[PDB]
Symmetry: none
Subunit: 195 residues, 2 copies
């Protein structure tokens, strides 16, 4: 039996994937679906409050065969079109006040185009940057937690906004379309693990 | 049972973390708490700096799965805000370098340990400055134990910068406690 964990940072990212299968809420307060040889679980990091907390994935869930982090990401290079779904090759965490970084490779999803991801705590609105591609908040955290249980981790990120103040309106107004892109990318992965 | 050792350089730094759990006092400056899954011990140094590290951690304690050194640190760069909790990626001695294991979901910084106080202003090469971290990481390596550090920015390294630390001791100690509590729960 193949056990797949999907991790979304927030409910808007998760919404359309949760509509794809007849999930039920279990007694542990997260979503679960199974059929044939596949268990499909969904966890959403930030349902409450102004920020996610480390205890969203600490201790990390054990027992899965693959984690997929699917979410929205800002585009910090204008040659990235919006509403495009990428898989991530490596994810960096950046601390702007010190410029210290950490970086981890992640497992690319077949037949999605490749991109690099940087995770930063604050929403990114400075502008465009030569050396950044996609920008999110939670990707690095999730990949590092996956390493603690030696579970492979893959990422799907859809370009959701350009990283400017004015660019944030697009994200605000297109959350359903963006969530739908994530759902459309997850389904063929789920389908390929049916034995 | 996971076994966690926390090391603080003085009581003020330790104070709010000690309030998080109903610790027992094993002996002077050595507190212990356990559940079925986790042993949490806290050692507070009897004096600051490398002398206090040698006194407390030579021989280094064996048997732990992780050491965490939590403390106040000076900011040697004005781009570092005060009252901010960092985890350390590497530590060097000012007057030799060691990798340190970052705690998840904390901003990242590099640490420089000095053997005498550092009111020597801003050096564009330095980030956070303390007196104990390098020596603690060195003792952890003797027992092949991972070491992590939590350092909250407590002062700038300019003249009279300790006034900010002195005025904010409780808030700074509470910041350390709030960063430590979830580490404990990461092992339940």
């Amino acid at each position: 039996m193949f056990k797949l964990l999907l991790i979304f940072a927030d409910p808007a990212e998760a919404a359309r994937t949760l509509s794809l299968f007849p999930f039920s809420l279990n007694k542990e307060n997260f979503y679960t679906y199974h059929t044939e040889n596949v268990l499909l679980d969904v966890m959403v990091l930030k349902t409450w409050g102004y920020r996610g907390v480390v205890q969203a994935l600490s201790p990390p869930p054990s027992g899965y065969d693959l984690w997929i982090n699917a979410g929205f990401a800002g585009a910090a290079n204008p040659n990235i079109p919006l509403l495009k779904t990428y898989t991530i090759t490596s994810v960096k965490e950046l601390t702007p006040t010190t410029s210290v970084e950490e970086e981890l490779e992640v497992t690319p999803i077949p037949r999605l185009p490749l991109a690099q991801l940087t995770s930063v705590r604050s929403p990114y609105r400075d502008g465009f940057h030569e050396h950044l591609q996609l920008v999110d908040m939670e990707g690095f955290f999730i990949a590092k937690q996956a390493s603690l249980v030696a579970c492979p981790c893959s990422m799907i990120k859809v370009s959701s906004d350009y990283t400017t103040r004015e660019g944030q309106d697009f994200l605000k107004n297109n959350k359903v379309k963006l969530s739908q892109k994530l759902a459309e990318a997850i389904f063929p992965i789920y389908s390929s693990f049916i034995d």
